[PDB]
Design a protein around this ligand. Structure first.
Ligand SMILES: Cc1cn([C@H]2C[C@H](O)[C@@H](COP(=O)(O)OP(=O)(O)OP(=O)(O)O)O2)c(=O)[nH]c1=O
Ligand SMILES: Cc1cn([C@H]2C[C@H](O)[C@@H](COP(=O)(O)OP(=O)(O)OP(=O)(O)O)O2)c(=O)[nH]c1=O
Ligand SMILES: Nc1ncnc2c1ncn2[C@@H]1O[C@H](COP(=O)(O)OP(=O)(O)O)[C@@H](O)[C@H]1O
Ligand SMILES: Nc1ncnc2c1ncn2[C@@H]1O[C@H](COP(=O)(O)OP(=O)(O)O)[C@@H](O)[C@H]1O
Ligand SMILES: [Mg+2]
Ligand SMILES: [Mg+2]
Lengths: 678, 674
């Protein structure tokens, strides 16, 4: 092939440097000589849209809200910008993973600008003017909806626009069977399911009269394992659950094969009491949760372990087991070193700053440890009896492109317009066969707006990832994202005239959420960073006082608004570095069918090679500082992968773990998440 | 000590075994042990109050009787000084049935106590019927099934039925529900058999996407883990079964999950209609079908259509997808797999439905864990969460067996079957199982019971009759004809007493009269004079009697959709001092504890011929002769010698099929035995 030959000329050194400028000709040799030759061209858009509608690719019910004169302008608004892919891989990933091919998969029916216009039309819901705003937002590459939303919007044979779910499992056979079903019902829809197993009683607990008969959390994982294989799942366990060790032992590569679940990623929920016990090397006790329920009438998973730990240890009716917390903490380091996960969640770093503890304290997370929301377990009763439908969690995700948002000075416009997009995706998803998910989506209206291209933007403006100026930039940037996200949530609250259920008891309504912003200023401390926000207003401490009073009068429409998820193949389309993380490689080498493909990180030039420092060469404690400073202005979580070298002892890894907990990190794991990325 | 007396049976003296030494061993078991470990009470009231106050017995059923009556019923049980004739007969009762204390260190319940509580539970307040129930069980004329006999009248009660049959529809919603129902029933200690014949095969379409289904095998693996999770909370009872019609495309992959060199704890059954046998006999190629392509074409499930009428049409319809296989190879494959695993249970579907009375409800499509219950069923449709489901008809097995020997000793064929039918009817009306809607609906609508029999070989050998003789079949033909006669009569008597009939009875062959064509034209009085003399003092119904019963049923209807089925007899066969079910005995003495067959002496040693020495073709003749008068099925285990080729095994299958055998397999079923 020809376009491959031009891309590989990057590695052919000329004058002592790589031929980065050879990728522009490789992507040019890709649009010519292939994809332009394989687009079944139409004479007019009307001929184009009618074929796509008559032959049943696009849904008809949403084009029916627009007059055709408007649809042509929206499509004209997309091509109006002469958009050119800067890299070969950036166009390769779109026209192979996103563009709509024909049913016989031999012709390209959709190009960029087509996907964007259809998506924009779907978002606007009939508003021709907003559909053009959505086009410009995505064609300037300021905002990028998640893969399930970007790919499946407006199509027939629709995959759900949500592809990430969190379930609560109650402690009964009835609830386990339902959780098995809901997992398959959601898995077939292309979504990832993460289940909290901490309310299930441990191995060797009682079943009514018989005293030693429960198979524990492990047995339910084997049921869930087969269920996901039939139709990527995850299971979180609180670290004080007795089965925590057997929970971790199903993921050793050397597992007994008869107990090894193979399609379940695992997560571990750790409250502060465990960190304190590990720090002082004294013996710790894990508990049989049903003895807690039998005694206190409440789920151990719903009580404050920081207040109840000593009481459980001293209650003789509570059954306990002695463990070594340092050995268990080192063990979490090895399994993460061996599988990337268990995803670690510092439970009290989430709820210290949680706005909706009146609904519930956050108890677990999703497949990549970014979604952190309240939840209430259901109780699916017998057949003839009514069930109690609680609140599960749905992940409506999307990320801004930090680079292009700064180039266009559109922090307010992009965040507020993206919020409308996520709110529309939430109101259009109506999932059946998963009742607690469905009830929670209409009641909580939670969205997850993220960001990407932090490292690419910093390296393209002469700023190092580990530098104090970088942290100073992120501190101001995400403070503005949080500002306008809250502002848009309150603006939507008055337009619609309602708030998310039980908002009256949130810290948004009581004002506690704004204590930090009305007392502390977040304008950049370095003048070099201040010059980056030229031409756009930095909200002052007086602005936050005004927003707090405005929210106090009209309320919030969303219970949760921001979360920073990983960016899968779409990061290539956006010509962006992955998520808010540092880059792993300056140039990537991938083997796609008898051909070597090279993709230098976006914007990588010979004059910024120093600034594209690879993550494995970085100080992970300084990386923790960066993620902690961003988490200050993210109400949910941030997917954080530690990039570790092989030559690190178990004391070095726990020192990084303990440090992250100290700085207030909510979630962490090392470096399956396909359904739950942007 | 009592073991030393029992083992003295095998110390041969005078050239023979010491069979009368078991009489002394059982005496040495009641003294020096169980009397030393039986909680003595001063009065019956002190006993009954302790058992009720300390929450062993339920109070709500003893509250229907005045204590003067309860004392009389208990007095009626001890009135017959009942003694176990063998050591094992009492050993199995006081270890598997008698109610021990909560700490398992003392025996709170003896025989006559268990019999009376069960009898009191059955009669539901009728003191006089409670005495009839006592006499019936203390004479050992009838024996309720293990789940009914063990758990009756207790607190923290286990279900009186422990055997279920499920239909599975072809959707994810229905598979999830079937997974749940299997676990919901297994935790209750029951065995559940699921019909998988409506599930689409591997490589069929899921809506738009082509070649995307995992087939029945993937559903078997989900059910497999489901039974392993819910094992009755530590009772080692992960007993499930899965049936597949042989014309299902996945039939080969279905059988391959049970090869030792491969899912475990899932028994399999194969439903074979006449068309498949015909194709194999004439060495013609056979076609298996993708069931969903049949559904898309004809709107009906392939499992609900007549393959003998539709086969050629299926083969010719180009919109129906088929696959060619060798039926001769598949029969040999069924022969070896049965020889190595006991199952696949084989069901000759057309031998079941030829004589089925309720084909208007459905043709029988599968069976239970041991191939005895054969009843109509209708698939449910478990829809989405916010939509209402459609509840079809599953199957429940309320089992019980009469003791053929003692029924002949008491000349009580009519009294026992009618009274046992009353007991099984009460079990059906007191079982209200939640988490299994179609099971619950069908039990109230169909009211199907399964009365069996045991001690057929033990009775024949104690009257100088060989199992393989024509006189044995002549006895079996006449005896079970009477069971079927008085069972139908009692079923019609209850229909008139209660004034109602089982749902859609009006369209059964009982109502149209076709059911009685054989009995009103052909006589079933014994042909051999030796056999006729055994029924002295008892009336053998003539063709004129059947005419009267047929007209009586036509006016009052039938209360039970199904009445008779001969299930295996588990550990309770020891308590009844009886040979297992209607099968021949496998060994004269079992092995350390030794148990000689009931009544086995040196003067009838010839008649206690061991089953592996018998001609299985003659055994088929015996089972075919009984099946004439059983409306459901008979659990039939072939007893095969090692020196039998896979071609020898197929000859037995085809013969049994020709002779009208309904179900067959080689030689677990614990939840579905009596
Ligand atoms: C969802 C799913 C179904 N199946 C099987 C199980 C059922 O036997 C069969 C029917 O599934 P259904 O749940 O009925 O699927 P559907 O109703 O969306 O589509 P259709 O119009 O074809 O009915 O497909 C799988 O094998 N894997 C799967 O992931
Ligand atoms: C039925 C059953 C349950 N379990 C486990 C799953 C659940 O986590 C736990 C609770 O089962 P449950 O369905 O709640 O049992 P129960 O309600 O009859 O009794 P209890 O009053 O104790 O709730 O037991 C098994 O491990 N094996 C089994 O067979
Ligand atoms: N970098 C690019 N990104 C996207 N499409 C491109 C690119 N370069 C060329 N094309 C495709 O080729 C067409 C124009 O071809 P070409 O002569 O290479 O470029 P231009 O006319 O912009 O100078 C565009 O309309 C588009 O379909
Ligand atoms: N074979 C047996 N079957 C049943 N009960 C027996 C048997 N042997 C002994 N018993 C029990 O042990 C008690 C003691 O028996 P024993 O005194 O020898 O005979 P009996 O009471 O008939 O004169 C009996 O009353 C009975 O409760
Ligand atoms: Mg419970
Ligand atoms: Mg369907």
């Amino acid at each position: 092939p020809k376009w491959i030959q031009l891309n590989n000329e990057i590695m052919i050194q000329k004058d002592g440097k790589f031929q980065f400028d050879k990728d522009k000709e490789a992507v040019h040799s890709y649009f010519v000589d292939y994809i332009n030759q394989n687009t079944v061209f139409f004479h007019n858009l009307k001929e184009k849209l009618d074929y796509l509608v008559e032959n049943q690719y696009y849904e008809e019910e949403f084009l029916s809200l627009y007059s055709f004169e408007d649809i042509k302008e929206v499509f004209k608004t997309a091509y109006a910008k002469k958009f050119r892919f800067p890299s070969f891989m950036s166009a390769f990933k779109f026209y192979n993973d996103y563009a709509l091919k024909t049913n016989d998969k031999k012709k390209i029916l959709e190009r960029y600008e087509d996907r964007i216009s259809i998506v924009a039309l779907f978002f606007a819901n009939g508003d021709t003017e907003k559909a053009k705003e959505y086009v410009n937002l995505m064609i300037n590459q300021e905002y990028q909806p998640s893969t399930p939303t970007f790919l499946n919007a407006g199509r027939k044979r629709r995959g759900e626009l949500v592809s990430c779910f969190l379930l609560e499992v109650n402690d009964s056979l009835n609830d386990i069977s339902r959780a098995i079903d809901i997992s398959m019902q959601l898995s077939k829809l292309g979504g990832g399911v993460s289940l909290n197993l901490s309310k299930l009683r441990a191995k060797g607990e009682a079943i009514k009269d018989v005293e030693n008969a429960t198979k524990g959390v492990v047995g339910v994982m084997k049921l869930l394992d087969n269920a996901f294989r039939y139709a990527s799942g995850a299971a979180y366990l609180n670290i004080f659950h007795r089965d925590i060790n057997d929970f971790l032992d199903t993921k050793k590569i050397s597992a007994d094969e008869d107990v090894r679940v193979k399609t379940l990623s695992i997560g571990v929920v750790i409250p502060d009491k465990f960190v304190e016990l590990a720090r002082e090397d004294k013996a710790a006790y894990v508990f049989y949760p049903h003895t807690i329920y039998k005694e206190y009438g409440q789920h151990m998973d719903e009580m404050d372990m920081n207040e109840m730990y000593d009481k459980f240890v001293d209650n003789p009716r509570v059954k306990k087991e002695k463990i070594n917390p340092r050995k268990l903490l080192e063990k979490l380091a090895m399994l993460r070193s061996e599988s990337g996960y268990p995803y670690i969640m510092f439970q009290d770093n989430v709820n210290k700053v949680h706005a909706n503890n009146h609904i519930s304290k956050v108890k677990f997370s999703n497949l990549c440890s970014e979604v952190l929301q309240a939840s209430q377990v259901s109780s699916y009763t017998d057949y003839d009896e009514e069930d109690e439908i609680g609140l599960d969690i749905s992940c409506n995700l999307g990320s801004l492109n930090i680079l292009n948002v700064m180039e266009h000075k559109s922090i307010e416009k992009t965040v507020k317009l993206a919020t409308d997009s996520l709110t529309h995706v939430s109101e259009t998803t109506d999932i059946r066969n998963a009742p607690a998910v469905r009830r929670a989506n209409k009641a909580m209206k939670s969205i997850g707006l993220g960001a990407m291209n932090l490292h690419g933007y910093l390296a393209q403006n002469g700023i190092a990832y580990e530098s104090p100026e970088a942290r100073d930039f992120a501190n101001t940037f995400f403070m503005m994202v949080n500002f306008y996200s809250i502002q848009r949530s309150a603006e939507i609250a008055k337009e619609k005239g309602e708030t998310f259920d039980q908002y009256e008891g949130s810290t948004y309504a009581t004002g506690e959420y704004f204590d930090k912003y009305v007392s502390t200023d977040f304008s950049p401390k370095y003048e070099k960073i201040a010059n980056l926000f030229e031409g756009m207003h930095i909200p002052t401490t007086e602005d936050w006082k005004k927003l707090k009073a405005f929210v106090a009068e009209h309320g919030m429409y969303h219970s949760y608004r921001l979360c920073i998820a990983p960016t899968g193949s779409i990061s290539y389309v956006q010509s962006s570095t992955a998520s808010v993380m540092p880059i792993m490689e300056r140039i990537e080498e991938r083997t796609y069918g008898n051909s070597k493909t090279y993709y230098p990180m976006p914007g990588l030039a010979s004059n910024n090679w120093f600034f594209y420092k690879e993550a494995y060469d970085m100080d992970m404690f300084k990386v923790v500082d960066m993620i902690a400073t961003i988490q200050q202005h993210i109400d949910q979580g941030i997917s954080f992968t530690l990039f570790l070298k092989d030559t690190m002892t178990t004391r070095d890894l726990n020192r990084i773990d303990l440090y992250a907990h100290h700085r207030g990190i909510k979630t962490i794991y090392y470096a399956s998440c396909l359904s739950c990325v942007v």
